[PDB]
Amino acid sequence: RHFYVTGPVVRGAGRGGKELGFPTANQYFHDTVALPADGVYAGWLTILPTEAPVSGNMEPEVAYAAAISVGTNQRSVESFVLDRDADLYGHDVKVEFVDHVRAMEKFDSVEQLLEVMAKDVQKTRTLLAQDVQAHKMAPETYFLQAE
Ligand SMILES: Nc1ncnc2c1ncn2[C@@H]1O[C@H](COP(=O)(O)OP(=O)(O)O)[C@@H](O)[C@H]1O
Ligand SMILES: [Ca+2]
Numbered sequence: 001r002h003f004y005v006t007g008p009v010v011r012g013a014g015r016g017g018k019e020l021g022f023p024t025a026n027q028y029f030h031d032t033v034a035l036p037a038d039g040v041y042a043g044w045l046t047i048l049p050t051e052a053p054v055s056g057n058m059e060p061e062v063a064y065a066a067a068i069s070v071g072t073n074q075r076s077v078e079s080f081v082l083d084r085d086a087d088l089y090g091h092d093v094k095v096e097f098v099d100h101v102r103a104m105e106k107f108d109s110v111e112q113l114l115e116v117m118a119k120d121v122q123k124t125r126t127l128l129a130q131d132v133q134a135h136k137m138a139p140e141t142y143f144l145q146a147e
Contacts, residue, residue: 022080
């Protein structure tokens with residue numbers, strides 16, 4: 001299908017995310033793990049098969065639409081799962097990269113950063129819908145809202 005990485009969702013600085021309305025599931029990787037260049041990507045986040053209870057509105061083995069930010073400190077992957085809310089900490093998750101949204105950019109203010117994040121989300125919805133429409137998949141296996 002798509003390029004992907006897996007690993008546990010871990011603690012970041014725990015500020016600048018949830019309290020601004022854009023919580024992101026942090027994963028970290030040694031830079032010898034293949035990843036795309038720093039930037040924002042449209043993709044799917046799946047909680048891998050597990051006996052662990054998940055708290056909130058995501059179930060294991062379902063691909064949730066995500067806006068994924070890749071950074072370099074060693075490498076980081078930070079996924080905002082669209083229109084969902086669950087405690088992902090400690091869960092083993094797969095992040096699939098579908099399409100490129102934009103290169104890394106710098107921002108004037110917190111407010112400008114949030115404006116761009118909202119644009120990244122809207123572009124993520126459209127790119128994923130275009131990838132759902134071609135390459136047809138079963139309704140039960142993915143989650144994506146148009147609005
Ligand atoms: N829609 C969502 N997308 C990503 N993570 C979410 C979402 N809703 C709740 N979470 C939880 O919020 C956490 C991220 O919040 P954040 O404020 O970015 O803190 P941190 O710095 O620890 O990454 C995730 O690890 C996950 O447990
Ligand atoms: Ca985060």
